[PDB]
Design a protein around this ligand. Structure first.
Ligand SMILES: Nc1ncnc2c1ncn2[C@@H]1O[C@H](COP(=O)(O)OP(=O)(O)NP(=O)(O)O)[C@@H](O)[C@H]1O
Ligand SMILES: Nc1ncnc2c1ncn2[C@@H]1O[C@H](COP(=O)(O)OP(=O)(O)NP(=O)(O)O)[C@@H](O)[C@H]1O
Ligand SMILES: Nc1ncnc2c1ncn2[C@@H]1O[C@H](COP(=O)(O)OP(=O)(O)NP(=O)(O)O)[C@@H](O)[C@H]1O
Ligand SMILES: Nc1ncnc2c1ncn2[C@@H]1O[C@H](COP(=O)(O)OP(=O)(O)NP(=O)(O)O)[C@@H](O)[C@H]1O
Ligand SMILES: Nc1ncnc2c1ncn2[C@@H]1O[C@H](COP(=O)(O)OP(=O)(O)NP(=O)(O)O)[C@@H](O)[C@H]1O
Ligand SMILES: Nc1ncnc2c1ncn2[C@@H]1O[C@H](COP(=O)(O)OP(=O)(O)NP(=O)(O)O)[C@@H](O)[C@H]1O
Ligand SMILES: [Mg+2]
Ligand SMILES: [Mg+2]
Ligand SMILES: [Mg+2]
Ligand SMILES: [Mg+2]
Ligand SMILES: [Mg+2]
Ligand SMILES: [Mg+2]
Lengths: 225, 225, 225, 225, 225, 225
């Protein structure tokens, strides 16, 4: 199976780089690649947000900001590339067809952001469609997908399995949210529907044993028609 | 003042180019650019759609389909440059920084698409925000922004002016209509909404006299806060 | 065997894209690549000529025109890349060494034009020499190579086998024709002589069963010392 | 006159950016650039070191470690540009030729690192030599060039002036200290030694008034022949 | 007026550079460029031929052989730039658009080869057409265009003037002599023929005074319609 | 075993290209690659020095000079690429990760210089570290490493085996020599220490039978902790 991992930056670099988690996920990844094709996309996280802010205080364009965020995601991506030793594609990948080449060479392509105007979630969902992958795996700072924000609405429960259409609902069906953040960012959630690619929304815990996550023996959310 | 023209491909290259119009529009741009900072983003039109449909038939990804789209828009981009002679940038522009330079060399940067995930309208709007443009002139293939697709609900007429919020509704603010065409791409519109940059929408007729157009005298829609 | 296919644009896109032919040639190609190395070069065709004209009406340089033509050939090339599914190199190739890489990865590199100053025939003959290929296959809007223009001179017969020197004659030994069109463009025909690479000039018919075309069981022309 | 500012990353982006200082330093640069040719190379600071240390943990090569470093310096480079608004080059500069252009467009080229094997100081010095700069202003995180690392041997005070040869000794001219940081990178120093270009070393305090600084009035070190 | 100088490599870098001539020719160019738009394409000379011959020995393709050629021409291109100091573009130019920019920044773009399949002469001529140059000055290693290769048929003398058609014959218009050197590359000549741009052919002697040269006063050949 | 060969330009191109040596080393290399991974780095040599000089006479920056030198090393590198037939990576490699790709494709990447500020020795030592190679092989115009310059100090003997620390001594522990030439250039010798990679310093003789050189049955110097 060809699998894509969309690792939220907040998870990889909460405040500083989570050395331990990195070593772990790397290990888990190196593990899964033994008998699967693996592509990864890393998030910017906290550090990204901070750099974005400074730019805001100088009123730079959305485009300009994105570029900065991208620079950062790529800085994080290279941390994993480092942890993955001789198993990952040598340098940060910047576009799908190059990621494709990496897969061909039986190596793990790790991507930061691509071009301006795309959240890591969206970039991941697309890198998936492009590679014609089987599963999209989202590690995030949340247990799974809840009927409502777990960190707010008390009447919020975790959904173990749902259809892309329902996911689009939970997250947000507003063309205003286009580009916002969430369990799964509105635009990515959209693509996932269009693509109908099976997605798993797990957290920092389940990520510890990807083998089970892959085969279902996990405690997250699963999305697919 | 800085203006950004969003010329429809189907307007510059209908089914088979209106050499006359092209010269007319090119000249106009030349004049306007004499006492203005002019940037121009062009469409791929019907030609693009065909090529994209073919790709659609072979179940090619969204990204690949967009590459084809971009590739064609830039073909058209060329024709304009050929028409703008020695006033335009010699090459089609691909990124905003390059477009910025053109402005410095006091030359007109003509762009096609930039990268996947961005309709021409969007690219234009984002450009207008990047360059801090004062106005965004959308020369589409329709008279203006009607209460509904003219070809669909003839119980419609245009709307000389309106709020960005009003626009988002005429084009359906459904997080799924992201990527559609319409008189103005949905996502592009929402971009204008948060940027609040004055946007005019005209047809090829008004397009014949840009000075009158940019000087508020026209028969299209003048969207803004 | 390593084989190069120089598919005339007129054949691929007569007026519009020949969907059927595309699906067929794709199928045939996907077939031949099963036990051969395959590189393709696609032509601009009708659509290319039209865009070139507009540029002429604005008196753009030969160089400028070529670029436009190239843009188009690449647009066509991507149509095949699409039809070839997961067998072709993901994106349009722009230069030999990159095409080389594609061959290494056991994928089919499809090229449009390379740089200004080279017809698809020439680009194909060269891509061949570079890859040190065994056979050059030319699909064109003609049955084969005739003693004279089939669509004019009545005393024109099809030659089943000839030497590169004779081909150079038929086509044209004038350093004035350098860059013109024909069964085989003068410059390409020249290279074919220099390279002495076996070439087969077939048409839209023979292209339907490449297996026989490859092994000789075809009805075209064969060129080789 | 042509001046090249070597702004420390830890000075522009301490642990969390001094928006105030950044505006102050950016403005200053704007003024100075009014009657001077200004080029600016920026550092990655503490942030870079962390990311590099992480890489160090996974035994990544020197080259890869430098890529990460470069990648971060250019993130910072951005923030300055965001601050320099319409006077700076829109993009971070990567090579000197590009930096040269910026100078022509009378814009300020802001650079991060260029390629592996070159500390920020070095890159700056080499730049100053490339552009034939008259002065090299090193705004580090220390008051000046002390007879010894202040944090180490408190029996030290600074040295208002000195010879390039004197500098090489304060930073240990051991062919192994090549790549170290210090108030001024060892290799960078030796570069200044053979180029003999006047170099000032100040802190963020003096950095607040560049006019006074470049006009010899400051409290740092003014290294030269 | 816009002029394009086609400086022979063997003239700028004989067997071992004429520092004197180089300064002389560089200065001249500087003066001429004061009230003219100057573009310069340079050759690889004897040095190129050697390296290419070596490649020839290992049966390397035409394309690869040209890459080596290009690679060397650009080495020379450098030396001129080093000589043109602050008036030339800092980098060797590779494409015409870049050469166009140089013209805008009122700097002299010095080019080597561009891509395979184009002799220096050709590249120059195509450049002259691209930039809409008024004259094409070919500074070859010979006095002028003789009725026959001086080193071959001593029964020859030069021809002060002539028609482009006359040129094509002195260099053999055989569709096989495409790629040869001669006083003027065959293909280059035919390019001049259809472009009909005034072309002067001189030696290093007349080359010493370009003002007199471009002002019709010289002893070479002035080819034109 | 993965092996890197740092072939001194002086050896490859003493005066002119040493055709014979090239054919030999190529043969030897093609031989060793049969059961090893091989990366090569070629030097500029005599020809490089000459071009550098001309630039010096026009007082160009160190950076500018390096670029020229690089151009040349790459010209030499392509000579080997030619000799290596269908065994080497098609074109000259310009950076490590690309060289990495070449190794993956079981091809021999031949590099000239990388970016300014690095001698071929240094570039080689680094390309080694990057690829995590087992042995660094230096062919030079000298028998091996001597206690002192063989071509000067009579009390100079050849050392058959030593530790990187001692090598750093012989060659030079001065941060002033940083960038100079020698058996092993000071900076490269430094890296070799840091990397502790086994290095063999042989000459034009031993290079004739790489199989023995590889397994120790040679007459050069060996460096390793
Ligand atoms: N219905 C929901 N279910 C789960 N999380 C939700 C929901 N609604 C909102 N959220 C929020 O989604 C957050 C999740 O994702 P997010 O903060 O964007 O991190 P990330 O994407 O993992 N990181 P990065 O790529 O660096 O941004 C939670 O911590 C919640 O505050
Ligand atoms: N409310 C509306 N007002 C006007 N046109 C509308 C509206 N709603 C939908 N449309 C459609 O918008 C179409 C307009 O734009 P579109 O087809 O996308 O062309 P274009 O943008 O000019 N060309 P190009 O850049 O090549 O795609 C019309 O012909 C209608 O079918
Ligand atoms: N002796 C000949 N034998 C065969 N065809 C000839 C001959 N002489 C001239 N022709 C012409 O060659 C044409 C063939 O090629 P051409 O029109 O250039 O198409 P193409 O190369 O297949 N397409 P493209 O790559 O898009 O240009 C025919 O249809 C004839 O009009
Ligand atoms: N003789 C000296 N004088 C002053 N500082 C010294 C001296 N010797 C060593 N140092 C050290 O130099 C440090 C200074 O520079 P450095 O840490 O490299 O910061 P930076 O260059 O400003 N930042 P950046 O560009 O992000 O690395 C001090 O804090 C000292 O620990
Ligand atoms: N009719 C002619 N008139 C003058 N030279 C001729 C003629 N026919 C052939 N030649 C040859 O042209 C040679 C001239 O040019 P060429 O050797 O190609 O040098 P170049 O172009 O100056 N150098 P470069 O750019 O490095 O190749 C002479 O030395 C002759 O051998
Ligand atoms: N201790 C030493 N042992 C051996 N050679 C020495 C020593 N000290 C100095 N040398 C010099 O090192 C020279 C060796 O290397 P060098 O001239 O730099 O050639 P290269 O590196 O092989 N070529 P290239 O890559 O083109 O510069 C000899 O010929 C000596 O003049
Ligand atoms: Mg997320
Ligand atoms: Mg539209
Ligand atoms: Mg043809
Ligand atoms: Mg420092
Ligand atoms: Mg010549
Ligand atoms: Mg050496």
């Amino acid at each position: 199976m060809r699998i894509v991992f969309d690792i939220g930056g907040s998870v990889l670099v909460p405040e500083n780089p989570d050395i331990d988690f990195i070593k772990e996920i790397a290990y888990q990844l190196t593990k899964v690649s033994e008998d699967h094709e693996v592509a990864v996309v890393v998030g910017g996280g906290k550090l990204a947000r901070k750099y974005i802010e400074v730019a805001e205080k100088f009123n730079s364009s959305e485009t300009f900001k994105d570029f900065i965020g991208i620079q950062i995601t790529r800085a994080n991506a290279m941390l994993l590339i480092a942890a993955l030793r001789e198993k990952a594609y040598p340098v940060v990948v910047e576009d799908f067809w190059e990621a494709w080449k990496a897969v061909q060479l039986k190596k793990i392509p790790v991507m930061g952001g691509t071009h301006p105007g795309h959240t890591t979630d969206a970039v991941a969902a697309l890198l998936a469609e492009f590679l014609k992958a089987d599963l999209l795996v989202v590690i995030t700072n949340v247990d799974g997908v809840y009927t409502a924000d777990p960190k707010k609405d008390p009447t919020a429960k975790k959904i173990k399995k749902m259809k892309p259409e329902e996911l689009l609902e939970i997250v947000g069906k507003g063309i205003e949210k286009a580009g916002s953040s969430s369990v799964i960012d509105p635009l990515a959630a959209k693509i996932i529907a269009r693509s109908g690619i099976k997605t798993i929304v797990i957290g920092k815990e389940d990520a510890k044993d990807l083998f089970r996550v892959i085969k279902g023996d996990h405690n997250g959310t699963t999305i697919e028609p």
